[PDB]
Write a protein that binds this ligand. Structure first.
Ligand SMILES: CC1=C(/C=C/C(C)=C/C=C\C(C)=C\C=C\C=C(C)\C=C\C=C(C)\C=C\C2=C(C)CCCC2(C)C)C(C)(C)CCC1
Lengths: 52, 42, 39, 475, 68, 488
């Protein structure tokens, strides 16, 4: 049972994590052009702050 | 002294090939006597 | 789990607590031995 | 002066007019053929001026070194494949054909111009030809609401990004006195500054919209679902190749070869692109949406490709992009050939296809597998050469990260093969029960699959090609 | 607002920091003959190519707003 | 020769799609003829194989722009395993006669992973090594996911994921050793003759280890194995368990004892304690497991600990014990899993308590299975014991090596526990009632008996006079261990 739970579950949890990450990151994509208008030019202007 | 595998292999492998092709024909259970399956394990 | 139903019928072995205090012993065993081995 | 570097472009331009005139007189003609003929004649005209003469400039507004030859031929092949696909796909819908190929060739001419340009005005005009043609083709089938919505959103976003690019180009004209060139621009200002960095970042914003990098990506998924499929097949390959040619020929040559912070910015964008596309395509059900996020991740692989400039990272980008052309066009040919017959639907409806149409299964399987980096297949060699180059320079996190995201992307690339192969006749979907079983599409699919399945081991003839191409870029 | 405002300040911080090259020479009045010369000396490709741009835009809008 | 050996099965496999049929019969004869001809090429190129180094290497140049060269090379350390794959994959094909479900794809993928298994040994370029290591993924994925098992979804997915994400540091490591200095080597020999600093020897080593310890599954890097070797038919399994684990062991030897010896000397105790952990862990998990196949998979996991110990020793004997164990288990586990597949085919059941006394009517598989089971454990007169004995002797002759021997010899007691309990549960006792009404399979058609007899002749010929298998690599292993002791 240590093999099937404490060893197996730990690595299957890797698939679970990189699955739920995809399930929860798509909400960044929301179907709004104005949200792109935000995270296009505000997506940058951080890249100027740690630049000069 | 010491014995070498080279002539042993050269003498065995033709017999292996011939018997392999022969016993390929000899068959049974898998053909019709039973075994509706298809060699998949489901 | 539910698949292991044979003469292997120990009840208090599938609980998460017992699994935890078993994995503790096994991991500590291999760890004591890897420390014994390096040093 | 010196219209010889221009011949190809105007040659294609000629047929644009022709494919409208025959389409204005007859209204039902054989225009799908001889567009292939002129594109082949263009790619044939490329060889006499590849290396036999030396590099030359038109008037300083246009240079035709080997790099421009590469990108022009690449975009031409993309247009050719997209035509061969779209002939009987757009005819299946109640829409014309002449204006379609007119606009497609126009985008092609724009992207074949922008790969050899070194002047701000001409960069902008060619960029806008390609952009506006894409805005149209995204919405060419206005019977559906989603097509028109995608065309609207893509048009508005691209107009804003282009205006940002145009502001930055204005600044870069401002700074160094006059100079609207590019070799003279990064010639009178040669030091770090605030305004040079602002111009840099705005041009990055303008380019990332083209090459689909994140966070500049939000158009790709929605547009690739909504838009016509063969339009997307040209869009990804050609717009990316134009974008990367623009990136090199601007950032390296006209812009500056001094303020090399853009390398850091492309590392950031590539990291995010790998982590986003290959992870979020893993949670999808449609093919076109999946291919969109795939394309994002593949762009990330390329972006670590050319962030390490040592005369091999650039070459690796070029080869991997040549290879992604074949791979992605093959995948789109297969999804076209599936969506035509009966299906017209998403991933889950591919199940049980190996019994009905094995040819399509071979095609799409090999293409999807090559995209994930499977042995002998061209995408594998492209990815390992990217890793070789980007590791040679000293980027260690990027290589491990891209390897890992390829290992993640194999999952959703193999879901499709689980459907098409593993699923047994007890698990077919309703679409495949009644599957029946055009010519130019089949020959294109074969010409594509044999390439992506054989152009990985036959690689020296087209590594010599690329390393001959990339002597020219500064570094 | 804040995003937009930041950009303005950022741009302003450039506009007042960089040493522009004022180039004290009287400009030229004939700003139409010169553009004619530039359409056929320097910037000829954009002329010839904006031609087909306008063609393609007409072909597009004519077949995207058509009522059918 | 090696290039013909590798490309003829693959090239001849591309003919199968346009090859006549009425139901699916003439494919398997073609595949078997290809396998037999290629094995003949092995043993005929083994005549001109003198017995220290690469006794034949045929280099070429594909990509000079990187350093990629088609550098095939045989060796004392790699020729036994080439013979082994050429023999055992042929016998897998000679075991897969009843495959009716998609036989074209079967005998295409089987021939593809017949060059994908000889290549990993007959390759000396570190990029082509990665290529051949990688090209086992899709064929094995389809071999598991289409035919074989109910949990084959999770099994195949977990397989390809782990053997991709841990087929990951092999390339990174080959690179990391390729550009330490001013030469773009990409070659085993030229890259083993380089002076690597300890600061990254033991980092590139762990990079190799995360790869060579999942395919040669060590402590937790095994959980793919029960699922991928449980949900798998027999002839698939013969390859998956008889060659690929040996691929891991071979590459471990050749990339971590000729090429990072200074870190090997510092990490070897880890391999040793890991090996005895592997033995005891796998044996307990096998005696606990009840199904039928997962049991024998954990038995393989148990038997790999002798390899870990023999490589993590430093004398000239433990290495030979490791290689002998490898050639032994490749011959033993193959017959075991073949008989398990046959027993499932006759019973349509795996679970132990759900059947008993089947050896009253099905009394031909019982003898063959008893013999292979006696061969699993360290029985004398066979190669399974010579390996164990040589490992014990060579290691002790070198962690204060008196406790680890005491723990590794527990397997001597602990293997027959689950093996003989399995025999008792399956074949001994009174026949089941009508609960087993599957008509006990007509006892092993001669065609199965030939498979296991030809797997059971070499094992005894080894166990009686083991030098037959040790004449191959007394020179190469001698040079390797002389190097690895010259460092220390
Ligand atoms: C091929 C090969 C090989 C081999 C070689 C050698 C090593 C040989 C030897 C050989 C010898 C030196 C011989 C011996 C003989 C013996 C015999 C002949 C015996 C046994 C057999 C039999 C008799 C069996 C039978 C049976 C069965 C089948 C079942 C169970 C029961 C019994 C056991 C009865 C190797 C490994 C390298 C590798 C691979 C390939």
């Amino acid at each position: 049972e240590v093999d099937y739970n404490v060893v197996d579950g730990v690595v299957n949890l890797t698939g679970f994590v990189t699955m739920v990450t995809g399930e929860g990151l798509k909400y960044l994509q929301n179907g709004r052009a104005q949200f792109y208008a935000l995270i296009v030019l505000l997506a940058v202007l951080g890249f100027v702050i740690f630049s000069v | 002294a010491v014995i070498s595998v080279k002539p042993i292999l050269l003498a065995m492998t033709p017999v292996f090939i011939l018997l392999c092709l022969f016993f390929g024909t000899r068959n049974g259970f898998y053909d019709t006597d039973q075994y509706h399956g298809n060699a998949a394990a489901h | 789990a539910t698949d292991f139903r044979a003469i292997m019928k120990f009840d208090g072995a599938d609980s998460p607590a017992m699994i935890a205090i078993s994995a503790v012993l096994i991991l500590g065993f291999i760890a004591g031995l890897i420390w014994w081995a390096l040093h | 002066g010196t219209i010889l570097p221009e011949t190809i472009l105007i040659v294609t331009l000629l047929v644009v007019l022709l494919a409208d005139l025959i389409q204005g007189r007859q209204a039902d003609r054989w225009t799908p053929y001889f567009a292939i003929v002129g594109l082949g004649g263009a790619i044939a005209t490329m060889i006499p001026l590849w290396t036999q003469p030396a590099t030359i400039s038109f008037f300083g507004s246009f240079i035709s070194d080997h790099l421009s030859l590469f990108f022009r031929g690449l975009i031409a092949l993309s247009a050719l494949g997209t035509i061969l696909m779209s002939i009987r796909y757009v005819e299946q819908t109640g829409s014309s054909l002449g204006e379609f190929m007119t606009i497609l060739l126009t985008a092609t001419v724009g992207g074949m111009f922008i790969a050899g340009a070194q002047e701000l005005v001409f960069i902008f005009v060619a960029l806008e030809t390609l952009s506006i043609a894409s805005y149209l083709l995204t919405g060419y089938t206005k019977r559906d609401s989603r097509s028109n919505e995608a065309a609207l959103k893509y048009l508005l976003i691209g107009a804003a990004s282009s205006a940002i690019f145009l502001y930055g180009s204005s600044l870069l004209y401002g700074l160094s006195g006059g100079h609207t060139q590019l070799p003279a621009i990064a010639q009178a200002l040669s030091s770090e500054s605030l305004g040079l960095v602002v111009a840099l970042v705005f041009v990055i914003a303008g380019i990332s919209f083209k090459i689909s990098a994140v966070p500049f990506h939000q158009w790709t998924p929605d547009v690739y679902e909504g838009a016509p499929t063969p339009v997307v097949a040209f869009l990804s390959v050609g717009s990316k190749a134009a974008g990367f040619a623009l990136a090199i020929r601007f950032l390296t040559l006209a812009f500056p070869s001094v303020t090399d912070q853009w390398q850091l910015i492309f590392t950031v964008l590539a990291i995010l692109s790998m982590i986003l596309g290959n992870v979020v395509a893993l949670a999808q059900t449609s093919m076109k949406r999946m291919l969109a996020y795939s394309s994002i991740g593949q762009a990330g692989f390329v972006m670590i490709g050319f962030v390490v400039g040592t005369e091999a990272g650039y070459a690796s980008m070029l080869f991997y992009l040549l290879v992604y052309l074949f791979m992605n066009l093959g995948a789109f040919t297969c999804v076209i050939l599936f969506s035509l017959r009966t299906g017209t639907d998403q991933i889950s409806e591919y199940a049980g296809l190996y019994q009905k149409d094995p040819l399509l299964t071979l095609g799409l399987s090999l293409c999807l597998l090559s995209l994930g980096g499977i042995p002998p297949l061209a995408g594998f060699f492209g990815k390992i050469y990217l890793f070789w180059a980007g590791w040679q320079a000293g980027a260690y996190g990027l290589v491990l990260l891209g390897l890992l995201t390829s290992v993640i992307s194999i999952y959703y690339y193999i879901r499709v093969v689980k459907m098409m192969v593993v699923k047994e006749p007890q698990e077919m979907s309703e679409a495949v029960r009644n599957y029946p079983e055009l010519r130019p599409l089949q020959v294109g699919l074969v010409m594509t699959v044999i390439a992506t399945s054989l152009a990985g081991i036959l690689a020296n003839p087209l590594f010599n090609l690329v390393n001959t191409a990339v002597w020219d870029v500064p570094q | 607002a804040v995003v937009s405002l930041g950009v303005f300040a950022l741009l302003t911080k450039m506009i007042l920091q960089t040493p522009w090259q004022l180039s004290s020479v009287p400009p030229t009045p004939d700003s139409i003959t010169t553009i004619g010369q530039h359409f056929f000396s320097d910037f000829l490709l954009p002329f010839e190519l904006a031609s087909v741009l306008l063609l393609m835009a007409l072909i597009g809008a004519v077949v995207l707003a058509r009522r059918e | 020769w090696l290039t013909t050996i590798i490309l003829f099965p693959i090239v001849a496999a591309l003919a199968i799609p346009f090859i006549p049929t009425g139901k699916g019969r003439p494919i398997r004869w073609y595949a078997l003829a290809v396998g037999l001809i290629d094995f003949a090429l092995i043993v005929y190129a083994f005549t001109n194989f003198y017995d220290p180094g690469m006794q034949l290497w045929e280099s070429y140049d594909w990509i000079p722009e990187i350093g990629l060269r088609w550098s095939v090379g045989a060796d004392g350390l790699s020729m036994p395993l080439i013979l082994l794959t050429g023999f055992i994959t042929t016998l897998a094909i000679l075991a897969a006669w009843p495959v009716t479900l998609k036989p074209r794809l079967f005998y295409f993928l089987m021939l593809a992973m017949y060059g994908g298994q000889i290549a990993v040994f007959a390759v000396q370029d570190m990029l082509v090594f990665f290529l051949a290591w990688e090209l086992e993924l899709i064929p094995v994925y389809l071999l598991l996911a289409i035919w074989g098992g109910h949990k084959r979804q999770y099994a195949a997915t977990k397989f390809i994921l782990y053997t991709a994400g841990s087929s990951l540091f092999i390339l990174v490591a080959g690179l990391a050793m390729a550009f330490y200095g001013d030469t773009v080597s990409f070659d085993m020999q030229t890259l083993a003759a380089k002076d690597y600093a300890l600061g990254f020897q033991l980092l590139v080593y762990a990079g190799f280890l995360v790869a060579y310890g999942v395919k040669l599954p060590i402590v937790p890097l095994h959980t793919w194995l029960p699922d991928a070797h449980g949900e798998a038919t027999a002839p698939v399994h013969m390859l998956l368990a008889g060659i690929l684990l040996k691929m891991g062991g071979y590459a471990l030897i050749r990339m971590n004892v000729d090429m990072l010896p200074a870190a090997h000397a510092k990490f070897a105790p880890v391999l040793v304690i890991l090996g005895v952990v592997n033995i005891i862990y796998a044996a307990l998990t096998s005696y606990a497991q009840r199904n039928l196949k997962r049991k024998i998979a954990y038995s393989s996991i148990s038997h790999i600990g002798f390899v870990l110990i023999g490589i993590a020793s430093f004398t000239n004997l433990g290495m030979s014990g490791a290689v002998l164990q490898m050639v032994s288990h490749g011959l033993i586990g193959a017959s075991l899993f073949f008989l398990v597949g046959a027993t499932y085919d006759r019973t349509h059941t795996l679970i132990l308590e759900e059947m008993g006394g089947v050896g009253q009517k099905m009394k031909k598989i019982f003898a063959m299975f008893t013999a292979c089971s006696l061969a699993s454990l360290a029985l004398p007169g066979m190669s399974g014991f010579v390996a164990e004995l040589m490992v014990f002797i060579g290691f002790a002759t070198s962690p204060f090596r008196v406790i680890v021997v005491f723990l590794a010899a527990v397997g001597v007691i602990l293997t027959p526990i689950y093996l003989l309990s399995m025999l008792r549960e399956i074949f001994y006792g009174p026949e089941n009632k009508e609960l087993v009404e599957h008509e006990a399979l007509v006892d092993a058609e001669p065609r199965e008996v030939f498979i296991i007899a030809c797997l059971l002749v070499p094992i005894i010929g080894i166990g009686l006079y083991p030098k037959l298998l040790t004449q191959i690599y007394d020179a190469t292993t001698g040079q390797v261990i002389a190097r690895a002791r010259e460092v220390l």
